[PDB]
Ligand SMILES: CC(C)(COP(=O)(O)OP(=O)(O)OC[C@H]1O[C@@H](n2cnc3c(N)ncnc32)[C@H](O)[C@@H]1OP(=O)(O)O)[C@@H](O)C(=O)NCCC(=O)NCCS
């Protein structure tokens with residue numbers, strides 16, 4: 001793996017919008033979105049958020065993330081963390097989270113990164129645990145079927 005990163009561009013939107021494979025995946029990474037995902041929904045998130053970044057390997061956009069929240073001198077919250085299905089388990093999200101942590105420190109002087117994860121998303125919970133995030137609270141949310149789910153709020157000091 002020879003990963004690089006850059007800010008997201010318009011031309012990346014169709015590829016990134018293709019990443020969520022089912023309603024569950026979309027809900028995990030973008031719970032306010034509606035299935036099917038679309039480039040217009042992705043572009044609306046980008047416009048509302050900060051720090052939209054892609055990860056690239058061998059000429060392919062394989063990952064995307066942004067900041068859900070940003071508070072100068074305080075914290076950022078990671079959002080919209082998505083990886084291309086063919087490139088899952090290869091370190092793309094680990095790489096991009098490291099990039100985003102640097103960006104939070106450098107641009108926002110953040111002391112902390114917040115990352116929330118839905119309970120069903122075992123891969124995510126284990127990912128963030130691996131990266132040094134600790135659980136802090138659990139909030140009730142509802143999925144598109146009106147069923148109760150648990151949102152696990154985690155954080156990590158940035159140093
Ligand atoms: C969750 C997701 C972003 C992980 O991206 P990824 O690039 O595949 O993850 P990485 O390869 O960087 O793996 C980093 C760590 O995440 C965890 N992880 C990733 N995929 C996993 C899987 N299928 N099962 C268990 N743990 C997993 C592991 O702890 C892994 O560390 P390890 O490989 O050293 O054990 C990706 O599966 C995805 O896009 N899922 C749908 C969108 C989503 O859920 N995003 C929001 C998460 S809050």
Ligand SMILES: CC(=O)NCCCC[C@H](NC(=O)CNC(=O)Cc1ccccc1)C(=O)O
Pocket residue numbers: 028029030031032068077078079080081082115116117118141142143151
């Ligand atoms: C890093 C990453 O991609 N994590 C996945 C979880 C979602 C991350 C983030 N939301 C939040 O952190 C919190 N926002 C919410 O809970 C919004 C919500 C609204 C209605 C029902 C459920 C949920 C986001 O919208 O990107």
